[PDB]
């Protein structure tokens, strides 16, 4: 009972720290996008508006790294509680230490204050004529900043209701269910499969369009792939795999985003089609109503189909008795067609009855078993 | 019993006439391909080799049309036998007459002997410069000759064993089955679904590549899409829907074949994927063997996984009693990892046992019902 | 009983008003297409033939807006009957008012009479050279007129038989079914799924091709994408995700229609494939006939396969007794091959019987349960 209070207190601290790590993680990304766009036209990389904006990214990274370190200090303490340890060194495995260093390395890649440049040589597309520019080093550190979006998944997991609720933990323990990050992903794909795929597709659209534009702007003198709508059109027909080819990136950074989008859009479109084809299917209760109304329609159609069979048969007999060769033959053709039409509706009614008796098979078995009791 | 002899006699005549209509129907197509490929090269359209090779197409069309007329006269006679009619005029509906004339129109389109030419003005691709050429009139009459392949479907149906066998007709009558060309298509897609899709894809490859080459050769001077291997490369990348765009046809005839191949290849590749995915699935008898061997492996894994749990548990105790702080700490990390490893294999074994019960559910129900008997 | 007469009366008026709003909604679209195509070459935008055709669209929009207003007043009266309210203000919510204004705004966008122009500056594709033209303002108002096609969904729903029939309303009430526009969509995709996707695809082909041509005609001095057969080719290679890239639109309007065709064509082709794959599958009554005939065929194959096993076994013995080394060796390779062929047919017969017993499992359960009764 003593460990139950500690476990709840430590979980609340971990959830609170994850919320602040996302606030500072997303703040640095936002300031990076603002600084990247403004440093092109508004001012230059040697201005005081760039030293004062890259010190906001740098300061936010320092606080973000502190929140990552403190978050893992709470995870170590929670380990020492669940596993009944007294020394934190028992938790320091080679896999935990690797992931601690991986998160720190990912969250420490940001534009360092100062004007640094490197010579970027790329061969243009189609013409394949060499082009050289003195691109800044703050472009190869701004793109990796998008890797901080992994904190979104941690926030979603920690804020999940069934992750900490005692009602769900007790029920999950009975079925031996592990409430890891895969379970939250699978439950999201069953509750709102279309909203998850639509949000992911739009988020990937804007992020990939900006990444291509931010990389292509150095080797683009005709505002072709360095335009936001020229990169939001370039990365729209790669997601759909149309691939017109009128616009392709000139660099290996825009070619690694087109390649990534082609992979993501190859599967997202197929998953979206599966979701759409699953929402256009009648439920088990709406299929019983549809079959009930079709049965009434087919019974009425068989009444009018058999009526025409006798109506044309007697019209044939009436004209035959009157000795009218052409009229008798004209109505004998109609009798044959009426019989064929009556056979067609009788067969489609038989098919419906078979379908009806195939979905009420296991349910009918329950009724027989109840009687035997 | 009298009509049984006449029905079998008329069915043999229909089968015999369908075979000869396919012999002459394909003969006209083959001679058309020979004459089309040679008129561009060896001789011209005003030679005596073109008057003698287009009279073979014309002569085979006369015989082919004669066999189509006689074949439908046998279907009229078979109608009067089944329906018990005495006048063939009762068999002449507006749908049968239209289909009789549709087949005759389709089978009468052949290159007429003689040298008739028309002006073909087309707009080239990627430049849209007009190109006027004096094309022969036998290019707009050779492409429709490929519509004679509908006789292949008729021959397959009339030669099918279950279409006429008295054992299959009697069984089909019990289940109210209709043995038409659609039933033959469905049975082929279940017996050999890959052979049907592989022969169709290969046959469409050669036919469409030749059609693109034949049409897109009056407006081609660089030997690009007027080459058979250039047309066979344009068509394949449309079937796979890659669409490089390096070569696109200059004519409306080559553009309507790439569109036709694109539609067919959109569905053929999807159907092929389903076939290759239904053959990689273990059958119900191979899943029981695989599950049986997995259960044996998991039981052996649990014996060695729990053995390591106790081995490290005692190794922790041995060093703790010897007062070795670092050694005991290392053997407590290994004990915790051994416990987690034991849990993982125990959970994956429980999942397999649940999967075994899910498949063996109804068969277990049958045994209980037998006991109640 | 009193409200039944008023609810049926108000439904008939709503159905009648929905038909007339489609008559005037589609008439304005048709006259828009006529005037757009004729004001290009036949006359100019400052003619008396354009002030008299754009006043037909304006006159039809006034009547259409009146029918929309009256239709929504009939919906208010129907709501006051169903919910039992007496004051129309109880029906005016923030969601109903928003959709009333949305339909008015959508249906009020039409080419206003007059000659107003705006400067359209685009950039040609494959060279991105500027191109500035003075375009009429009636091109940015003609395209939104296609949003009146939402009235087709309203007409389809109100004209649905089960939407008002008392037999379907009572049966649906038992299963707690909601007869809305989504239910009609789902029943359409089960009754005729290949007639809904084919009509939608063809209608989208004509509409999108005209929209592309209309926009891609102020910035087309080569008649490349401004041609109707050159716009249909573009839309078709985007629907099938081929993307040759020989023609791409020069404007954002054409690039938006081509992006909408790519999204629709990604899912429409996948949905069509699933339809053609569920129609090429043997039904539950045709599988039993196919399995019955396969069982007879496999039994006959086993008789002839075992006959070859013994025939070669004795032929081996006859030559061995005759002291013929080469003959006996040849008849032993044939015997081993005959045994393998006998095993192959015996195994595939066992597989078929496994499939036959798998489908007839639950039906056999019903027979046992009936016997226990």
């Amino acid at each position: 009972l003593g460990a139950l209070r500690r476990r709840r207190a430590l979980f609340e601290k971990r959830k609170r720290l994850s919320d602040y790590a996302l606030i500072f993680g997303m703040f640095g990304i936002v300031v990076m996008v603002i600084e990247t766009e403004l440093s092109w036209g508004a001012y230059d990389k040697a201005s005081l508006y760039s030293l004062a904006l890259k010190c906001l990214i740098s300061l936010s990274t320092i606080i973000l790294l502190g929140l990552i370190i403190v978050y893992h200090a709470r995870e170590i303490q929670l380990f020492m509680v669940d596993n009944g340890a007294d020394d934190w060194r028992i938790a320091m495995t080679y896999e935990r230490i690797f992931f601690i260093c991986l998160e720190i390395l990912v969250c420490a890649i940001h534009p360092i204050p100062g004007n640094y440049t490197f010579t970027w040589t790329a061969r243009l597309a189609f013409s394949y004529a060499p082009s050289t520019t003195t691109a800044d080093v703050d472009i190869i550190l701004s793109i990796p900043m998008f890797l901080r979006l992994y904190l979104i998944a941690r926030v979603m997991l920690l804020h999940s209701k069934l992750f900490t609720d005692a009602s769900s933990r007790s029920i999950g323990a009975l079925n031996k269910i592990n409430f890891n990050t895969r379970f939250v992903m699978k439950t999201l794909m069953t509750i709102c499969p279309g909203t998850v795929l639509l949000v992911f597709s739009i988020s990937l659209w804007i992020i990939a369009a900006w990444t291509v534009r931010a990389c292509e702007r150095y080797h683009d003198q005709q505002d072709v792939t360095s335009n936001f709508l020229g990169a939001m059109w370039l990365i729209s027909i790669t997601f759909l795999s149309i691939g017109y080819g009128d616009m392709v990136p000139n660099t290996y950074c825009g070619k690694g985003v087109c390649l990534l989008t082609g992979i993501m859009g190859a599967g997202c479109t197929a998953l979206v089609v599966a979701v759409v084809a699953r929402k256009l299917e009648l439920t088990k209760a709406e299929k019983h109503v549809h079959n009930f109304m079709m049965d009434i329609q087919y019974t009425k159609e068989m009444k009018e189909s058999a009526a025409r069979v006798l109506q044309e048969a007697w019209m044939f007999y009436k004209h035959t008795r009157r000795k009218e060769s052409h009229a008798a033959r004209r109505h004998q053709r109609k009798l044959l067609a009426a019989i064929n039409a009556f056979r067609q509706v009788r067969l489609k009614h038989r098919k419906l009855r078979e379908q009806v008796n195939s979905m009420v098979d296991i349910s009918k078995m329950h009724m027989i078993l109840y009687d035997l009791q | 019993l009298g009509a049984l002899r006449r029905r079998r006699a008329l069915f043999e005549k229909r089968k015999r006439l369908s075979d000869y209509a396919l012999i002459f129907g394909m003969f006209g197509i083959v001679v058309m391909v020979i004459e089309t490929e040679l008129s561009w090269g060896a001789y011209d359209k005003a030679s005596l080799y073109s008057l003698a090779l287009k009279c073979l197409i014309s002569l085979s069309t006369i015989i082919l049309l004669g066999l189509i007329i006689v074949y439908h006269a046998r279907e009229i006679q078979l109608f009067m036998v089944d329906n018990g009619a005495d006048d063939w005029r009762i068999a002449m509906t507006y749908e049968r007459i239209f289909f009789i004339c549709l087949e005759i129109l389709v089978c009468a389109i052949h290159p007429i002997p003689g040298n008739y030419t028309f002006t073909w003005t087309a707009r080239l691709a990627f430049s849209y410069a007009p190109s006027t050429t004096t094309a022969d009139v036998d290019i707009i009459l050779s492409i429709p000759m490929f519509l004679r392949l509908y006789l292949i479907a008729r021959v397959m149906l009339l030669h099918s064993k279950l279409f006429t066998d008295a054992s299959s007709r009697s069984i089909g009558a019990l289940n109210k089955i209709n043995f038409n060309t659609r039933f033959v298509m469905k049975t082929l897609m279940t017996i050999c679904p890959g052979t049907v899709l592989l022969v169709f894809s290969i046959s469409l490859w050669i036919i469409a590549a030749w059609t693109v080459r034949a049409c897109e050769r009056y407006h081609d001077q660089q030997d690009v899409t007027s080459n058979f291997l250039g047309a066979m490369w344009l068509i394949s990348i449309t079937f796979l829907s890659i669409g490089y765009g390096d070569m696109v046809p200059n004519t409306y005839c080559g553009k309507g074949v790439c569109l036709l191949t694109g539609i067919m290849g959109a569905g053929c590749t999807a159907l092929v994927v389903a076939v290759v995915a239904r053959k990689l699935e273990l059958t119900k008898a191979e899943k029981h063997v695989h599950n049986f061997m997995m259960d044996i492996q998991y039981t052996k894994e649990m014996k060695e996984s729990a053995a390591r749990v106790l081995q490290e548990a005692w190794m922790f105790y041995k060093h703790t009693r010897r007062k070795e702080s670092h050694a005991a700490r290392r053997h407590q990390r290994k004990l915790l990892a051994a416990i987690n490893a034991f849990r993982q294999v125990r959970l994956k074994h429980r999942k397999l046992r649940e999967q075994v019960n899910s498949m063996v559910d109804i068969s277990k129900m049958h045994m209980i019902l037998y006991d109640l008997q | 009983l009193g409200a039944l007469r008023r609810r049926r009366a108000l439904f008939e008026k709503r159905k009648r008003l929905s038909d007339y709003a489609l008559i005037f909604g589609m008439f304005g679209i048709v006259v828009m297409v006529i005037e757009t195509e004729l004001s290009w070459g036949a006359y100019d935008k400052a003619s008396l033939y354009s002030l008299a055709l754009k006043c037909l669209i304006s006159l039809s929009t006034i009547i259409l807006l009146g029918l929309i207003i009256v239709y929504h007043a009939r919906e208010i009266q129907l709501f006051m009957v169903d919910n039992g309210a007496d004051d129309w203000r109880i029906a005016m919510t923030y969601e109903r008012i928003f959709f009333i204004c949305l339909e008015i705004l959508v249906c009020a966008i039409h080419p206003i009479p007059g000659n107003y122009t705006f400067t359209w500056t685009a950039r040609l594709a494959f060279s991105y050279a500027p191109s500035t033209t003075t375009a009429d303002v009636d091109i940015i108002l003609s395209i939104p007129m296609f949003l009146r096609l939402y009235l087709i969904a309203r007409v389809m729903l109100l004209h649905s038989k089960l939407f008002t029939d008392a037999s379907s309303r009572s049966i649906g009430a038992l299963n707690k079914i909601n007869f809305n526009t989504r239910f009609v969509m789902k029943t359409l995709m089960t009754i005729c799924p290949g007639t809904v996707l084919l009509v939608f695809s063809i209608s989208l082909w004509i509409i999108a091709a005209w929209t592309v041509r209309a926009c891609e005609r102020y910035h087309d001095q080569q008649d490349v994408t401004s041609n109707f057969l050159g716009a249909m080719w573009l839309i078709s290679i985007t629907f099938l995700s081929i993307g040759y890239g020989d023609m791409v639109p020069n404007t954002y309007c054409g690039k938006g229609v081509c992006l909408l065709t790519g999204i629709m064509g990604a899912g429409c082709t996948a949905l069509v494939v699933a339809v053609v794959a569920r129609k090429l599958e043997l039904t539950k009554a045709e599988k039993h006939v196919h399995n019955f005939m396969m069982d007879i065929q496999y039994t006959k194959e086993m008789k002839e396969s075992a006959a070859r096993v013994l025939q070669e076994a004795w032929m081996f013995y006859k030559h061995t007794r005759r002291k013929e080394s080469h003959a006996a060796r040849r008849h032993q390779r044939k015997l081993l091959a005959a045994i393998n062929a006998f095993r192959q047919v015996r195994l595939k017969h066992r597989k078929l019987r496994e499939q036959v017993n798998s489908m007839v499992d639950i039906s056999k359960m019903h027979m046992i349960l009936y016997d226990l009764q």
Binding site: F126, V224, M247 | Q222 | -
Partner: peptide
């Protein structure tokens, strides 16, 4: 550019 393919690509 001899052909129109090279005219279109070198311009883009």
């Amino acid at each position: 550019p001899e052909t129109a393919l090279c005219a279109r690509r070198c311009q883009q």
